[PDB]
């Protein structure tokens, strides 16, 4: 359009380009769109492309000051959803120029943050986003990633073991350090603050950091293995966040954690850059299937959020538990794991992957398993997550009848028995009970752990 | 309630009972089947937390025979009978160690 004509217009003629082949540099998005009744699919897809890019609810004269054809998002393909009929899949391409370099949420909130519909869409859901390699290279990514983290902690050949201190709230700093010390000396690689342990009246953050670090050094000397505790630096302001991270580094803490939900993207991205500058490992917690990622027809799918968290940066990523999930979503669990750790993820509709995602050299992220898991879950966990994972047993360790050290040892024995059995070629999920029962013959701690919780 | 006894550990598999020949052999077979190159590191017990242990010769790049790795473990043992000895497996695709565990805890 070369001439200005005020007034509301349809979006199909500008924002629906069925003959458009996406450039390699394009940000691609797959939306599950349920259009308003009567509205054609091509128009509704065009409406989402307009509102998430250069479109306005009415024609503006300022469009003619730039070239819309270059800058606009444009829907280029529509596909039926297998199962539903109301919804359809819109594939929309966004020129890479639309986004701030190294600011992956600026992609995200442009796409769905403030995209209400332009009166043509009654339901939107962002399924997948292809971040082109050109854009990936501008993001910080994980400050260290799997391979460097293993080198720094000198840990090889098995999943790492962690544990959140319980109760979630209420412990004094010294009692917190006692719990940490007992877990670490018993065989856990890591302990961690609970996500909502920041700096409360019952335990100020600086006191916690000091006692925890003393606990970490003591257990490391008494086991001869490197130990860590994710010190939670999540804070109300960035200054406070950086101050706590600086104190963690000052006292020699190898690893910190950040609640991405509490803190937000800006804080997390800054923290991840800080962590790479200061050689501190960064554990990220972002609950999924909670508010944002649980509704199957309304919201942002967790694999998009997973991609964002990897670009924003984190050496570990945790959402929810995987074993309690059904065998059906286990295929989605395996696809989730691959987005975190692999360099190139090919398209696979069965797993929910609509685009090839190329990470290039961006480091992978440790996948974290938590939840109400105990020793009996260990075979499934080892089989599903493999070696490049952290298995966190909070209640499973502090809930052992003989205390933290024994609980840590039980989990450590169970983990190593499963890893050894896997390396011997045994099907550890099918033979799980027998593997644990045999290892329990030499580990009284494991024996009573298996009696404490049910197979 | 039982009291947990604190002792030094040796990272992966050190919480399991010490490995016999078959369990060690199975891990090396796994590493070779993954396409990783077995290597041997050793260090004085007090220096076990250093990032850089002594490397025994070079990593056995493209070694397919498990018995060759076992023989070199024995050779390293004899050369440094008081050192901790670690079996590593280099993963050149990740430029990481796919696997690492201590085969002799040293003395």
């Amino acid at each position: 359009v070369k001439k200005y004509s005020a007034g509301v217009k349809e979006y199909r003629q500008t924002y629906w380009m069925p003959e458009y082949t996406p450039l390699d540099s394009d940000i691609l998005a797959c939306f599950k769109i349920t259009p308003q009744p009567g509205v054609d699919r091509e128009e509704a897809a065009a409406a989402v492309a307009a509102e998430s890019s250069t479109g306005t609810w009415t024609t503006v004269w300022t469009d003619l000051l730039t070239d819309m054809d270059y800058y606009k998002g444009r829907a280029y393909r529509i596909e039926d959803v297998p199962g539903d009929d109301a919804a359809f899949y819109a594939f929309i391409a966004y020129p890479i120029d639309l986004f701030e370099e190294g600011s992956v949420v600026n992609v995200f909130t442009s796409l769905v943050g403030n995209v209400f519909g332009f009166k043509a869409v009654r339901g939107l859901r962002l399924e997948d986003v292809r971040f082109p390699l050109a854009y990936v290279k501008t993001c910080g990514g994980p400050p260290h990633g799997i391979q460097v983290e293993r080198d720094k902690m000198n840990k090889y050949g098995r999943p790492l073991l962690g544990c959140t201190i319980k109760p979630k709230l209420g412990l004094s700093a010294k009692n917190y350090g006692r719990a940490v010390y007992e877990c670490l000396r018993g065989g856990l690689d890591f302990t961690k603050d609970d996500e909502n342990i920041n700096s409360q009246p019952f335990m100020r953050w600086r006191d916690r950091f000091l006692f925890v670090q003393d606990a970490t050094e003591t257990a490391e000397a008494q086991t001869g293995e490197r130990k860590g505790h994710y010190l939670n630096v999540t804070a109300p302001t960035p200054e406070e966040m950086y101050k706590r991270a600086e104190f963690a580094k000052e006292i020699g803490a190898p690893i910190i954690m950040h609640d991405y939900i509490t803190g937000g993207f800006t804080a997390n991205t800054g923290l991840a850059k800080w962590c790479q500058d200061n050689g501190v490992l960064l554990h990220i917690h972002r609950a999924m299937h909670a508010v944002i990622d649980r509704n199957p027809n309304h919201g942002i799918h967790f694999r998009v959020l997973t991609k964002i968290l990897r670009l924003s940066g984190g050496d570990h990523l945790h959402t929810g538990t995987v074993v309690g999930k059904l065998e059906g979503d286990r295929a989605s669990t395996l696809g989730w794991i691959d987005l975190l750790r692999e360099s190139f993820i090919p398209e696979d509709r069965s797993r929910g992957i609509f685009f090839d995602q190329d990470w290039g050299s961006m480091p992978g992220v440790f996948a974290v398993a938590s939840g109400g898991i105990h020793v009996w879950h260990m075979p499934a966990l080892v089989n599903i997550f493999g070696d490049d994972s952290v298995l966190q047993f909070g209640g499973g360790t502090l809930g052992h009848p003989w205390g933290n050290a024994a609980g840590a040892a039980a989990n450590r024995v169970a983990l190593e028995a499963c890893v050894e059995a896997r390396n011997q070629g045994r099907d550890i999920e099918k033979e799980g009970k027998e593997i644990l029962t045999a290892a329990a013959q030499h580990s009284p701690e494991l024996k009573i752990a298996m009696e404490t919780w049910k197979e | 309630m039982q009291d947990y006894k604190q002792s030094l550990k040796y990272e992966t598999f050190s919480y399991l009972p010490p490995m016999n020949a078959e369990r060690i052999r199975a891990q090396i077979k796994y590493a070779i089947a993954q396409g990783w190159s077995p290597g041997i590191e050793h260090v004085e017990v007090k220096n076990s937390m250093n990032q850089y242990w002594y490397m025994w010769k070079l990593p056995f790049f493209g070694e397919q025979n498990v018995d060759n790795v076992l023989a070199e473990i024995e050779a390293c043992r004899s050369a440094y009978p008081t050192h901790q000895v670690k079996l590593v497996a280099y993963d050149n695709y990740a430029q990481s160690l796919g696997l690492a565990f201590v085969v002799y805890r040293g003395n």
């Binding site: 390699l133 799997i146 391979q147 750790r341 692999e342 360099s343 190139f344 993820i345 090919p346 090839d356 190329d358 290039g360 050299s361 480091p363 992978g364 490049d388 | 993963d91 695709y93 990740a94 430029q95 990481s96």
Partner: peptide
Amino acid sequence: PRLDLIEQA
């Protein structure tokens, strides 16, 4: 990992 599954491969 890292470079095993590249677009280059």
